[PDB]
């Protein structure tokens, strides 16, 4: 059933993804279809993620530790839109890996790093949520640490992403020109088999479990129920506000799992039964999921807008060059003081709370 590519070479038709078009694998139009999907994605992913990164940096008020983690996520998405999607697009219209083996490596490595980093960052977010809920004590926490933490996630991400570059597994996806870890063969010199189990479980699965677990602990504490006003089942507006953040974080995770999980499952199943067909082992299946994972890059900016008024209002401030932020503003801390932005609403040295300075702000 299999050749180096997913299709059988009953005919001599099969040709290397590096050398020629893969038109035999799927209809040519399907190639343009995937190319089309990528092109549109590039626009959305770039604009949305840039907006997120831009807005939080631009608006002084949105400086939360969580915001730091989100920039990290946004950054990971940006790399996808700039780095990975572009190559994936070129290939698609070419119908194969014009770039050749070196590039397959470059292209797989960066995209792999992006996926690993995302799930790992989501875990940090989960843990931080747990910490915020149980121990509101603000001082046990530092912005500086967050940067350190973010860097750490990247380091671990490299731990999986980089070793394939080290003599380890390698390869292109079903129709593909997307490159990923070598699930198909057990290229012995390469020691593929070991790498495969290790990577999925350690990088994707374990972090998924932790996020799930941390999620459960949060269940006892702040839950979905949150009354819009501070009053009612909320003990302080800040407490009531936080519940909003947690819910978005939950949705962010959910969307993440839905997008990626199918790929990871297919990752493993072919590992167990390579050279065979799953329900059907084909170009189409592997392809659909990996490209689907790419869509994730776009979803987070949408969730933010829908999910939180603060970003929504603050973003709008950014969109219209001037303030022009009608629509009711944040009606809370657009900024703590009032409106928030680089300028405009976010007044220098935003106000402080408590005789002492409760939040590390107004420093």
């Amino acid at each position: 059933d299999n050749v180096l590519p997913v299709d059988s070479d009953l005919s001599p038709n099969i040709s290397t993804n590096t050398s020629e078009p893969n038109q035999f694998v799927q209809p040519a139009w399907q190639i343009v279809l995937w190319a089309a999907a990528y092109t549109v994605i590039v626009v959305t992913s770039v604009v949305g993620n840039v907006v997120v990164m831009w807005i939080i940096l631009a608006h002084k008020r949105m400086r939360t530790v969580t915001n730091y983690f989100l920039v990290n996520l946004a950054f990971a998405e940006a790399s996808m839109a700039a780095f990975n999607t572009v190559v994936n697009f070129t290939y698609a219209v070419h119908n194969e890996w014009y770039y050749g083996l070196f590039y397959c490596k470059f292209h797989n490595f960066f995209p792999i790093a992006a996926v690993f980093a995302s799930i790992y960052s989501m875990t940090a977010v989960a843990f931080d949520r747990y910490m915020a809920i149980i121990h509101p004590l603000q001082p046990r926490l530092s912005a500086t640490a967050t940067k350190v933490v973010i860097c750490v996630i990247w380091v671990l991400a490299l731990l999986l992403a980089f070793p394939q570059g080290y003599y380890s597994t390698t390869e292109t996806m079903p129709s593909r020109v997307v490159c990923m870890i070598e699930w198909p063969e057990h290229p012995n010199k390469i020691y593929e088999k070991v790498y495969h189990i290790c990577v999925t479980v350690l990088i994707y699965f374990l972090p998924l479990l932790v996020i799930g677990y941390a999620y459960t602990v949060v269940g006892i504490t702040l839950w979905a129920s949150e009354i819009p006003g501070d009053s009612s089942d909320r003990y302080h507006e800040q407490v009531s506000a936080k519940r909003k953040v947690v819910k978005m974080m939950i949705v962010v995770v959910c969307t993440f799992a839905i997008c990626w999980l199918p790929f990871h499952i297919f990752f493993l199943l072919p590992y167990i039964n390579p050279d065979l067909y799953l329900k059907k082992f084909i170009q189409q299946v592997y392809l659909a999921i990996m490209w689907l994972a790419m869509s994730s890059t776009m979803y987070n900016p949408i969730i933010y807008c829908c999910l939180n008024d603060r970003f929504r209002l603050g973003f709008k401030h950014a969109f219209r060059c001037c303030p022009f932020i009608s629509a009711g503003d944040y009606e809370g801390l657009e900024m703590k003081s009032t409106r928030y932005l680089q300028t405009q609403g976010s007044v220098y040295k935003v106000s402080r709370l408590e005789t002492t300075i409760s939040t590390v702000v107004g420093a």
Binding site: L4, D9, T16, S19, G100
Partner: peptide, 11 residues
């Protein structure tokens, strides 16, 4: 079976 000619120049 893959063609050996591309072996020299896989790229």
């Amino acid at each position: 079976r893959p063609k050996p000619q591309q072996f020299f120049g896989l790229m």
